[PDB]
Design a protein around this ligand. Structure first.
Ligand SMILES: [Zn+2]
Length: 219
């Protein structure tokens, strides 16, 4: 029995949702995503691994007066797209970049209903921006920046303590990508990694350092 889905308030209009999967090392590993409340509507930033937890997360907010306006998945792995099938099935708009949908399709997974490309994309005009620093953890990974609170959701592109699974990683490009991220969001007040506790802009530096170390230690 895996731990129960958790939903904790991180900042005004921002919640961190946490779900868990069983791996082959850390046994049970926590996966953090967010929920951004704009007006009386909620935007899911990454989905839980399963339909069960995505449903629990959706209903938690629906029962509090919030309509689910949509979800955005930061990379193709289930940790971020596990709930797209369920959300699609409820006609809740789901978003992913073209690269992500291509990896999903290729992996025989259901794709986001709405796609996008380019370095940056505003999911919600001046409130939720999606940024692509380039390949790192996976070919498609993106981050989501909330300008108002200065919060950066890094998903698993932010690896401040070690890079983890390199299976779909691009070790030679990760450094460049992390440099661009660090220059782009040095102003973040909070950086939310997928598997670790929340931190400040230092996580961008630390991620860069691990990426560099990883490239060096590869050749
Ligand atoms: Zn991943």
């Amino acid at each position: 029995s895996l731990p129960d889905l958790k939903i904790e308030k991180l900042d005004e209009g921002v919640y961190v949702h946490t779900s868990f999967e069983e791996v082959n090392g850390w046994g049970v590993v926590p996966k953090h995503g967010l929920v951004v409340l704009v007006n009386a509507e909620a935007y899911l930033i990454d989905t839980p691994f399963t339909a069960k937890d995505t449903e629990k997360l959706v209903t938690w907010f629906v029962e509090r007066g919030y309509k689910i306006k949509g979800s955005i998945s930061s990379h193709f792995h289930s940790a971020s797209t596990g709930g797209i099938e369920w959300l699609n099935s409820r006609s809740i708009p789901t978003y992913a970049s073209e690269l992500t949908n291509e990896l999903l399709k290729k992996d025989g997974k259901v794709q986001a209903t709405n796609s996008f490309s380019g370095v940056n994309y505003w999911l919600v005009k001046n409130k939720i921006e999606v940024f692509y620093p380039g390949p790192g953890h996976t070919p498609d990974n993106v981050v989501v920046w909330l300008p108002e609170r200065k919060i950066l959701f890094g998903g698993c592109f932010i690896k401040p303590y070690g890079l983890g699974n390199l299976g779909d990683a691009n070790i030679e490009a990760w450094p460049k990508s992390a440099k661009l991220l660090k220059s782009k969001y040095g102003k973040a007040k909070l950086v939310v990694p997928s598997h670790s506790e929340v931190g400040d802009a230092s996580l961008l530096k630390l991620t860069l350092e691990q990426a560099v170390k990883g490239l060096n230690e590869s050749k």
